[PDB]
Amino acid sequence: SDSKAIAQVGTISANSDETVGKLIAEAMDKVGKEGVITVEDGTGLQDELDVVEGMQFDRGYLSPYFINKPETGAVELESPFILLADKKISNIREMLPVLEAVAKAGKPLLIIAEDVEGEALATLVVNTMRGIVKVAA
């Protein structure tokens, strides 16, 4: 159970390589009992470990203009609202009351849906930079 025994086992199973055992021990200490550790090819000459806390999925923004910080080229929202819609969002008329209520609230909004077509994306992005609502899709 202790980290020393885990490091020793990882070293022995890796053809007596101390660094691999130490890295695996640190990774399993950080990620917890229920976590998952994966191995992929790197780019440099030294191994590295990246730990992700929270939830993360491989889906990005649907429009580059949603970016509010060009310094890092990323969209960041503080205390947002999350709308979960499992229906094909095509016409803006379906989203009027929610956007009006959130604009009355005054805090950013995030839409997680499978897809959004061109018209609704254009309406949202137009609303973004004008200072009405801060929305990411």
Next chain:
Amino acid sequence: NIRPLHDRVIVKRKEVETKSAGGIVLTGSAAAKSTRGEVLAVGNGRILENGEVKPLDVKVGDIVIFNDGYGVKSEKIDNEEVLIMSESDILAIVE
């Protein structure tokens, strides 16, 4: 000046609103063309079977709601788009 004939009415289509029920800007096909216009010129009246003419109920200066159709025509006068269309397409008068 331009005057219609019989029961045709000259109207000026109002600008389409960009904000609907709040500050949200509507752009694209969601913002439908306005169905409200300002009447400009009114003809003498529709001709009856007997031969007499009756004046129109709509008066110049009012705001009317009309339905777009095949009988509605768009003409360019005084470098400004106007609509020449029959009185039968007027649905209601605002105020």
Next chain:
Amino acid sequence: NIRPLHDRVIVKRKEVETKSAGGIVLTGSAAAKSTRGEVLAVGNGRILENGEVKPLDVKVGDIVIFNDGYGVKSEKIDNEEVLIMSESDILAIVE
């Protein structure tokens, strides 16, 4: 205020019932649009061929049953859906 012309009437359609003959909730395409509405504004009357005008039979405040068709139009007045429709499409009046 909105007033019609000739034989047109302003109605607002009643909300579609969710419970039909019991507590079963009807959702989807089964719940069709209601064919009953409350009349709001009534025009002066239809213009006859000879020239005189006759008032409508339907009076403001009654519940009417109307047939949806190409002649019925829906307008966005004062943030409230209403229907402009010719009196010929009125079928019957409740009570």
Next chain:
Amino acid sequence: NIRPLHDRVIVKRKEVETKSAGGIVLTGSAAAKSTRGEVLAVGNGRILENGEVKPLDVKVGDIVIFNDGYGVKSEKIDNEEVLIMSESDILAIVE
């Protein structure tokens, strides 16, 4: 209680009989919708061109034969199906 407008009539179609000229029962598409109904409500009458109104020939309580078509509409009143249709669509009256 509902009363129709002008020259329209409330009828309820009779049940489709399964016994047909003997003991053989008919089930499926062979048993077509009955073309006979009982009149329930009758309007004041059709409006003539000159202006006066003439009462309908059909009286409430008689059995009529009607040709179902596009002008015949079915509504639910008192949780019971009834038909609104123009008097000109009445074909003949039994007895």
